[PDB]
Design an enzyme around this catalytic site. Structure first.
Site, PDB file in Angstrom:
ATOM      1  CG  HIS A  41      -0.540   0.093   2.640  1.00 57.43           C
ATOM      2  ND1 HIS A  41      -0.278  -1.195   3.320  1.00 57.43           N
ATOM      3  CD2 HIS A  41      -0.218   1.308   3.364  1.00 57.43           C
ATOM      4  CE1 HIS A  41       0.102  -0.633   4.501  1.00 57.43           C
ATOM      5  NE2 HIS A  41       0.064   0.518   4.668  1.00 57.43           N
ATOM      6  CD  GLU A  72      -0.620  -4.518   1.572  1.00 56.03           C
ATOM      7  OE1 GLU A  72      -1.178  -5.157   0.701  1.00 56.03           O
ATOM      8  OE2 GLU A  72      -0.458  -3.080   1.659  1.00 56.03           O
ATOM      9  N   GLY A 146       1.335   5.286  11.145  1.00 55.12           N
ATOM     10  CA  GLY A 146       2.694   5.753  11.202  1.00 55.12           C
ATOM     11  C   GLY A 146       3.354   4.495  11.607  1.00 55.12           C
ATOM     12  CB  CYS A 148       2.401   0.744   7.629  1.00 51.04           C
ATOM     13  SG  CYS A 148       0.594   0.489   8.003  1.00 51.04           S
TER      14      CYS A 148
HETATM   15  C1  LIG Z   1      -6.937   3.987  -0.523  1.00 49.05           C
HETATM   16  C2  LIG Z   1      -6.144   3.224  -1.784  1.00 49.05           C
HETATM   17  C3  LIG Z   1      -6.351   1.617  -1.623  1.00 49.05           C
HETATM   18  O1  LIG Z   1      -6.239   0.897  -2.435  1.00 49.05           O
HETATM   19  N1  LIG Z   1      -5.881   1.301   0.020  1.00 49.05           N
HETATM   20  C4  LIG Z   1      -5.835   0.013   0.171  1.00 49.05           C
HETATM   21  C5  LIG Z   1      -6.562  -0.745   0.943  1.00 49.05           C
HETATM   22  C6  LIG Z   1      -6.081  -2.138   1.536  1.00 49.05           C
HETATM   23  C7  LIG Z   1      -4.926  -2.698   0.635  1.00 49.05           C
HETATM   24  C8  LIG Z   1      -4.381  -4.028   1.189  1.00 49.05           C
HETATM   25  C9  LIG Z   1      -3.945  -1.668   0.177  1.00 49.05           C
HETATM   26  C10 LIG Z   1      -4.299  -0.302  -0.218  1.00 49.05           C
HETATM   27  O2  LIG Z   1      -3.659   0.251  -1.261  1.00 49.05           O
END
Ligand SMILES: CCC(=O)Nc1ccc(C)cc1O
Length: 182
Positions: A41, A72, A146, A148
């Site tokens: 993210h 992630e 803060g 992450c």
């Molecule tokens: C607001 C932008 C968006 O897509 N947010 C987001 C939400 C969950 C994850 C795992 C990644 C992310 O980037």
């Protein structure tokens, strides 16, 4: 204060940088050579700031498992003039639960921050911000915006990077040795 904090400090003092994208400032773990990790993210692009220096991104890969499910973790190779200490031997080989972990953060907002989070569960599946995510670790600490990219360690192991929370629990993406074979 004790041997957990000792191992965490040793990782922070040599194997972290402050990364800035358009999505914010993140703790970034350097793993070996010019290769680091950051939560996906963070939306890494072609240029990133590393300790407030403009840096070209040579490669970036958002990892997914073999079921094409988000993990992630983004692996980033930086056009930096200096290598990281190689810490791949501190990475676990398999998915596991842990005792007595520390979450460590270093940003402009939270410098030199260390949190004893206690027991870490192999939680597995999490709907993280609407995105189905696998290989999630959970700890019962009320982590905040803060944190992450924060590094999760035990004595002698670097086990994950902080990617979210629900106000009562915090969640990290696993790091596995197999992500960084060369
Ligand atoms: C607001 C932008 C968006 O897509 N947010 C987001 C939400 C969950 C994850 C795992 C990644 C992310 O980037």
């Amino acid at each position: 204060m004790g041997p957990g904090f000792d191992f965490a400090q040793a990782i922070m003092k040599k194997n972290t940088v402050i990364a800035r994208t358009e999505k914010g400032e993140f703790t970034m773990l350097g793993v070996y050579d010019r290769v680091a990790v950051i939560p996906t993210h963070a939306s890494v692009g072609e240029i990133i700031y590393i300790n407030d220096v403009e840096t070209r991104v040579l490669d970036a890969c958002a990892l997914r498992d073999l079921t094409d499910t988000n993990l992630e973790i983004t692996i980033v190779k930086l056009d930096r003039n200096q290598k990281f200490r190689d810490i791949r031997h501190f990475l676990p080989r398999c998915e596991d639960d842990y005792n007595d972990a520390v979450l460590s953060v270093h940003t402009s907002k939270f410098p030199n921050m260390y949190i004893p989070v206690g027991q870490v569960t192999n939680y597995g599946f999490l709907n993280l911000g609407g995105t189905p995510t696998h290989r999630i670790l959970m700890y019962n600490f009320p982590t905040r915006a803060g944190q992450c990219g924060g590094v999760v360690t035990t004595t002698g192991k670097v086990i994950g990077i902080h990617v979210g929370g629900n106000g009562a629990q915090g969640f990290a993406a696993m790091l596995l040795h197999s992500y960084f074979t060369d």
